Symmetry: D2
Subunit: 479 residues, 4 copies
């Protein structure tokens, strides 16, 4: 018999016994102890929510969309085997997030182990494998009409993409299934739909996107010898508004100036603690925080706990790390100086991130300073805001249909919709913070920053005339 569970976002979800069996494992219940928004909780006090319930919701919506397409179009021959596989993918899609979610794969691992190219998705695949094997799920999958050989590939492929037609999990006549959980084509997936609704509910922001409606106007059509999901022509407006809502949530919440500084501070503390924390892995081998990603039995035990483990410890080897975390409780955070963007089409490459603190200290502002500041005193945080496909417009990669010809797929350009849409679909934000908190050093930092902006032909800080009044007239372009 089905099991019913009450999510505050989606209401009463039914869970197929196979799903319940996957959910009730240490690998999945692990997600109860990892917050969705990482350090965001320390700015938005509503945002206590964890991956566990997000993972449930994504599984649910995956089920909704695939099941809806099947009702709408029997010709597709979507089996309850396909449905289950899509649900399972959705359910397990973020199994591989680290402590504090995106802080881990986005800040920490890149710093701790620059050699590796590792993502939360790759983790999810490996963790899924470990979940299946350590809990004897293969027999249960068979019991409910699945074929582990084919289907475990199909599930993995939904999550990370592919391990001519690149997929071994399903044929070309069911390519639409790959667009549900994690849409490689345009980015419109149920992952987004859940976290919009969920993050908004818990943050204290209202969500401007109706996933239910998009489902009612979704439909599979042939596009280039392949069956893919298409939206109705009228929905094009709502789809641009979906990616606006995404970018807006990043601006207000996910990339919040203090949320990000807390993320960097927690990352900093992890880096200092990494050497002295051991985690028992497979066959008892000892793994560090940074190396737990290599073994899943170890990574199973690596959660937000590691924060409090560091905070509460008395090991003097951890004193450096513990002091950073104590500074977060007391709220002696590194101080925000200002924000800026590049101009023209000057993209700042990732390689150069290391060097930018040096450049800020190196500026010679024509103003008398009390204090000189070294490059180690500065933090520069570079942030790429986009519409999910770097410089591309994702709507140019969406297929549409008309009321008059619902099997005929078409394209809608930007010009066909509106002149009030974005000109570009990607940019960079550069936040500068200063490690020295005091009145004297903050004034100095501001002068260095606003000069550095003029030095590199960046945009004038919004507060620029106030914070560095002596420096802003210098630039001819700012008048």
């Amino acid at each position: 018999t089905m099991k019913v569970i009450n999510d505050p976002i989606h209401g009463h979800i039914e869970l197929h016994p196979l799903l319940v069996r996957i959910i009730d494992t240490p690998q999945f219940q692990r997600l109860r102890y990892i917050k969705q928004l990482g350090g965001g909780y320390y700015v938005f006090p509503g945002a206590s929510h964890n991956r566990f319930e997000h993972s449930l919701g994504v599984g649910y919506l995956a089920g909704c969309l695939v099941h809806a397409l099947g009702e709408k179009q029997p010709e597709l021959q979507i089996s309850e085997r396909d449905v289950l596989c899509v649900q399972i993918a959705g359910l397990c899609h973020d199994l591989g997030h680290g402590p504090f979610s995106h802080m881990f794969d986005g800040r920490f691992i890149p710093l701790a182990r620059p050699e590796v190219k590792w993502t939360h998705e790759q983790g999810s695949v490996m963790m899924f494998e470990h979940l299946i094997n350590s809990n004897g799920i293969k027999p249960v999958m068979e019991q409910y009409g699945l074929i582990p050989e084919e289907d475990i590939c199909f599930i993995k492929e939904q999550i990370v993409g592919p391990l001519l037609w690149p997929y071994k999990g399903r044929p070309e006549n069911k390519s639409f299934l790959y667009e549900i959980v994690s849409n490689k084509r345009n980015g419109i997936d149920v992952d987004k739909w859940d976290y919009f609704a969920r993050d908004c509910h818990h943050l204290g922001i209202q969500n401007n996107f109706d996933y239910k409606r998009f489902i009612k106007f979704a439909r599979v059509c042939e596009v280039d010898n392949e069956l893919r999901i298409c939206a109705r022509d009228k929905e094009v407006g709502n789809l641009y508004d979906m990616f606006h809502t995404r970018n807006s949530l990043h601006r207000r919440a996910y990339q919040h100036k203090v949320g990000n500084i807390i993320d960097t501070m927690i990352t900093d503390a992890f880096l200092k603690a990494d050497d002295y924390i051991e985690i028992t892995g497979a066959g008892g081998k000892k793994y560090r925080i940074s190396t737990a990603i290599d073994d899943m039995e170890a990574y199973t035990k690596l959660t937000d706990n590691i924060f409090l483990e560091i905070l509460y410890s008395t090991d003097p080897k951890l004193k450096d790390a513990r002091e950073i975390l104590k500074q977060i409780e007391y709220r002696n955070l590194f101080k925000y100086v200002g924000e800026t963007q590049p101009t023209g089409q000057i993209k700042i490459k990732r390689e150069d991130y290391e060097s930018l603190p040096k450049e800020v200290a190196s500026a010679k502002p024509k103003v008398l300073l009390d204090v000189k500041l070294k490059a180690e005193d500065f933090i520069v945080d570079v942030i790429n805001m986009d519409y999910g496909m770097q410089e591309k417009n994702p709507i140019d990669h969406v297929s549409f249909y008309c009321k008059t010809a619902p099997n005929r797929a078409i394209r809608i350009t930007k010009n066909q919709v509106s002149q009030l849409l974005p000109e570009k679909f990607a940019e960079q934000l550069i936040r500068v913070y200063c490690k020295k908190v005091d009145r004297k050093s903050l004034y100095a930092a501001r002068q260095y920053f606003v000069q550095w902006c003029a030095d590199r032909n960046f945009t004038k800080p919004q507060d620029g005339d106030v914070i560095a009044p002596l420096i802003t007239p210098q630039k001819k372009e700012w008048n």
Copy 2:
């Protein structure tokens, strides 16, 4: 005080003066005029009326002004000022006609092209009539108001100045910020917007993406060019662009909905045909028509959405033409939507030319075999200006800001200082074409005329263009 439970704002308190204004035929009239006019016939939640909107705007006016006063005693905002602002907010949409914006936006312009009339002008006149016919002046005095000065101040909040130096007679320059609460002439950020965002969304079935409460917490008065004006915090600039995005989005989805607009035009059409034969008793018994009731307020008091059902239920054969249009709305034989398009380059379609556009569509000679030829009277062309409230201008360039480090120092934030993902332009035109003939044969024809007319004038390709007129879209070199 009197407490009243609005579903949007919760439990509002109402000052006895306000209650006394509310309980008048001129104000209770707003119970019988829907917010979204013909929108109710597309969004079945949107039953809501001006009455409750008017309450909410009054409330939020009170919130903002009272908040500024707490935050900044130096401004010397009196409870007299507060009441006046509340009253303005309360009465700000007293002058909407039947079906709200349909009246001042479609009907009056067609019925009486000579007049320049707006719902605001109506509100001023209706306010005057309310005060005089209900003996409010004594009550205003009783609660510390000065009718001479203050009734001007209230009117001025609603319509702007009643005539580069200081244009207002109601209040001096050191209280200019008060004029920015109810109806903000500078940039358009007002509590009118804040209520109807929340309200329309609640009733429509759309979620609202703008937090008015938050903006209030980061609002503040500063000196700007020898004048004290409301300023928002530097960080809020993002949310302010998102306010006008939310506005434009609501127009796209709801207010300018293709069918909502065709129902508006159909009701307007029926009013035009009924205008000659409907009398409304005015002041001293003089007889006024639907189009002329705006001249007298005693008559206009009785002019509400009722006029729809009056026409529908009538048996006067003089009204048969009008009644038949309205019966066609019940049965849902609406004029059929053909498609939408925009001009290209910077080709603005002037208002003057609106009359002529049906002629142009019929005039197109599509290279396709048609069953039926269609005359210009068969077409309706509906031109819609979508903007950020200041025609082609960026309203954020007309907002003043402050910093945490210097909260009395006002500043400007340009577009470039915020984001590269903002809109390039801040106004555009949408051209919807509909056909009066509903049948399968005439609709196909209409589509061919339309898609040709688009290629003929170098307009954008209709989104559905390759489907509806497959033979015509390859013709244009620019569409490949």
Copy 3:
């Protein structure tokens, strides 16, 4: 192709072309011009909502429940014909409400025409018939696999119950009795009509709703009970079901029976009574009908909506001056003043017969206090209100069937004692509100003295404000100390 419509309560509903065809008729679109809560809008300024959108929602939820039972239990053999019929019933279930909804069938018609036993439901049946015939729907029903003979009966029967211990229904057999429990549940009162208006009225009123209809649907199930297949809820839901009827009673207390909402209802009713004689409405073949007689002809009743309020208000006919003056008094807010509320004691039920006489009794009281003014019986209004759990004195949960996790086909009963000691002792009571037509300071004081005496005179409960309003009278009663 289906048509999609965005209701703020239920989201994006799909509408089957047959339903759309029924919706787009003058008989149905009529419901756009009748408010859900009648005079409640004049107290809760959110409550602008109309029957139209309620009717949509009830149709939708009817579809949800029946479609859900079918997925859960294929053995029931619920056809898409059955589904459509249930949706249509739900959609059309309140087609027959009058102007200001329950004011019409509940106050006005009983006063205007005491001879008739008429309800909004009976109206809906007749109006449904008129809708079908005047719009040629029968052919369209056939086109989508319905059988008008059988099914139009089934639809009517869902709305009003049986059209007259054997099986009473001619529309469907006993093996599909569960279908009759969806739209309007004669057994216990748990229906989708309630579920919509809870959610809807709350949304528009400014009150939060404490009942989850979606959840009850997930734990609904058909079982055999006494040679008949009926809907049963899971044993654990029993708590939520008592809370459903609590939520109902709570909404009546706060909103539907609000002291001022009711006085405005009586005032509008009063104005209609005075206007009835002089308002004509064109009916079938042009025959002239009055407000009170429009219920006899549906072509006339089609044109009878909340409009009739504004028609009276805006008129200049001097025959309507009495009616127009009452309605003008509502604009200006010179309402009849509330004096207080009371209940009977013991097991003293006040019969409907006696309602006429109660104003006489209040004036007749001789309070031992010096009054400036004597008041006549015509000056008083007494409004008697029956608050119940939908089955007069009965506990509706004693008429619900339940199932267990361990035996989901075996139906059972759950008594009150098996659930909780904190449940209600009784399931019906009476509320008596007294108002005075004379508004002034002097007459209101007098009215209060008459009322609080009348309460002591008939061994009713002490008014909550009693010691304040009539301080000289409350010590008189030995039972109040």
Copy 4:
């Protein structure tokens, strides 16, 4: 300058710098790592929320109510000193909850240390003292016009009641109403309840049926027995009974959920087995156990929900028993629910007897021969008191009311004056029985023992009784 913070329940709260200074301490930020609903998260997956944000909201609402009374009634002379003190009390009121909130003070401490009478409130007082002293707050209180001698007593007194005629040393009798805001000893109507109703509902997935904002608009201070206390308007009496109904309803659906409670008992069980082998560093480095950390606040500061994962992740073999219970929660091999029952007549089960009830269930001799016999250690009996917050009393009989006609005159409203459909009693007991042995054979047995035990003690028939134990239910004459 004030600090603004965005709570999803209450919106944008302003925080006074003194409050911010209290919030940013290890003693307060500790509450980020303690869930509101303890083990409820393992049944309601929305309920991730923690005490931290609850504590914020209670502080906020405390501010709202006290500030509202002050505006409504200047005669009370409520100082911004009083306001701050009330806010601080509200903010810090649940500073002393243990790991998994009510599991700690309600299940664990009573079992681990039966000698002590300890509550989360007593903890909050001690933790407040530790917060103030370890962070040098006293100087800051003085800086914002407080008097630490008087006011720190007043704050503590708000939380726990009197620290020893008028019982309070913190404030005089003419400000007794202030003690009714944060934690209302008289009737239980406090802002603590108002927040968690709204908050728990938001996160659980249940809609809340109580409007705190409205009650505030109709709240008022009147004299009652030589003392100034908060009174509600006569009409609100209905809503107040509905407040305590909503409370009881939330306990039934959520807080006392059969599985939520079994997970609480299982976590408690694991803590008991782990208690001996877990050390926590306290003041001057002294070693404290989980059960003894309550004696020292420096230790208790580090005692949070963490202790769950500490046990789960450990490899110490001394903790193997505890770790195995917690692993059984992940895998979902929970102790199985057998059924629920209530006593009859006026048979109250005293707390003393709780220990003995498993013995009694095993001791029942059900007249059908059972293939496995079960020992008393195999059973868990969970006794739950559901009340209206004052044991057997009606809390509305301890509320004061006022009338529109006489707003300074306080009165009483009995049950009979309101409704015949109200509850007959205001307290009852629920007895849940679970079995530690999970298997098919032992569960059948357990059911037979339970349903017999019910008939043996003249308890109510289990709702599922005829199904689970069909052979036993006809035995009882009273069940037919």
